[PDB]
Design a binder for this molecule. Structure first.
Ligand SMILES: OC[C@H]1O[C@@](CO)(O[C@H]2O[C@H](CO)[C@@H](O)[C@H](O)[C@H]2O)[C@@H](O)[C@@H]1O
Ligand SMILES: OC[C@H]1O[C@@](CO)(O[C@H]2O[C@H](CO)[C@@H](O)[C@H](O)[C@H]2O)[C@@H](O)[C@@H]1O
Lengths: 270, 270
């Protein structure tokens, strides 16, 4: 009675919150939780897999998009359950996640309602060979669904880091003439980067830039101004993923509701 | 070949940094790392221990002071190496750590050089039945070694949380008439709580209160003003500990140096 969790080496604090949920469901069901990290080296990846098989895990919960297909296949082929959390990793397996389009669309809805038209997505916005650019694509769809045009849509960044937020409006764009009035930050720390870059250059959020972040973890509460955020229920995602495994005997996608918490980082332009 | 790491369910971000160092050393030596979390429920602790025994781990690295003695004894009695990190858990086992007294005394030295006499320790300052009040005792020793008196020594708090920092100067002392000019925060988040409580009540750091934190993780760089801090080398603690396990052919304490990084959160009162 052991389940494994594969966590990327480089992660936001979302993982810890998911783990808290997994743990409370595992503990009350008589299972124990084995946590292992996954880097980008295919040979270390295979060792990690030998660790999962050797501890005879019943299930493996995947929190990383960098999981090689062969690991998913090999686990399934050993009759181990594989479930992905916060991401749709393979058509072969079930997933528990917040609904990405609904999250993004709720933010765009709100920003447009507050009078914003020129809006940037800042954070993980890159196109790649093997990973869907989920947030970039949803942002663009939502903006165009709202009858805005390419000229209103701005993008910056390759990851969810503080530094990406900070650099976006200092070296990515001209901080004195930002061409957008609002930024959607793909993670909380990106929002914190944006706040500090503005403050460090004689400007203030939200007067000079409105910000909404995705995740709603503790950084949004300790930021000043406090950050408006889409709060994900990471612990519920963890609980529901474990429950799915426990209740199992067709792959399924379960969407966990989110909510937009309004704090102090958005200005009404109307 | 597998090694375990036992992490408290409630932890600062220091654990991930330790684990980064453990991870790089385990990888290069052909071991795999299993991470497990420990609550304060003794039955759950025991179930976990059976997860360490039955994974036939070669070593267990302990990050938490809440480890029951029976767990350390049972692991040693099964010929498993046990090494504690950042804390001296038991006289029976080796430890790798920053030197606590030197960290504390480095801060007190500096604040006194900067003209401060009335100084608070804010954060984990409580006395208990089973756990040494390490920082409380070191602060008092260092202050008195510098020929300051009990009337110059102020203490607040029971843990390393943001909330403890925030409440210290709102419920703990009168924010308009603080009896100390500087606070030593026992973790970075406690410092951030102090900054926000001051700012939220119309005050300014460092003019109205000087702050120095212990740990020197990312929050100290994100804070405005940037926090003066004693930076611990958490990855190196992890690396050195794993290497101690790999080299073993009697219990020792290995101390890893720290550095006081002077930033923008301390006023020179001279
Ligand atoms: O941009 C979304 C994209 O990034 C990943 C991590 O690579 O998202 C994880 O991290 C985000 C920031 O903390 C979370 O908001 C998200 O829920 C989580 O999955 C990918 O998983 C995702 O496709
Ligand atoms: O106050 C020191 C005391 O607290 C513990 C945690 O209970 O310290 C850990 O967390 C601190 C704050 O992040 C770190 O500065 C410290 O290095 C780490 O050990 C105990 O271990 C320690 O005795």
């Amino acid at each position: 009675r052991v389940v494994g969790v594969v966590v990327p080496l480089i992660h936001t604090n979302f993982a810890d919150e998911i783990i808290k949920g997994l743990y409370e469901t595992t503990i009350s069901s008589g299972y124990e939780l084995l946590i292992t990290y996954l880097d980008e080296d295919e040979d270390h990846q295979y060792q990690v897999f030998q660790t999962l098989l050797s501890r005879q895990v019943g299930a493996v919960f995947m929190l990383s998009l960098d999981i090689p297909s062969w690991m998913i296949d090999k686990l399934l082929e050993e009759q181990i359950s594989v479930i992905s959390l916060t991401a749709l990793l393979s058509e072969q397996i079930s997933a528990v996640t917040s609904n990405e389009f609904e999250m993004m669309n709720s933010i765009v809805d709100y920003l447009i309602d507050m009078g914003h038209k020129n809006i940037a997505l800042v954070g993980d916005t890159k196109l790649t060979t093997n990973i869907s650019s989920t947030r970039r694509t949803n942002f663009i769809k939502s903006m165009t669904d709202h009858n805005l045009a390419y000229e209103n849509i701005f993008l910056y960044g390759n990851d969810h880091s503080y530094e990406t937020g900070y650099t976006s409006v200092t070296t990515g764009y001209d901080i004195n003439q930002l061409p957008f009035t609002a930024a959607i930050a793909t993670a909380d720390m990106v929002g914190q980067g944006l706040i500090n870059a503005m403050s460090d250059h004689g400007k203030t959020v939200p007067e000079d830039l409105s910000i909404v972040t995705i995740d709603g973890l503790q950084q949004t509460e300790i930021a000043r101004p406090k950050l408006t955020t889409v709060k994900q229920d990471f612990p519920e995602i963890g609980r529901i993923a474990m429950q799915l495994f426990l209740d199992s005997d067709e792959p399924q996608i379960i969407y966990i509701p989110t909510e937009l918490i309004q704090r102090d980082s958005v200005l009404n332009l109307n």
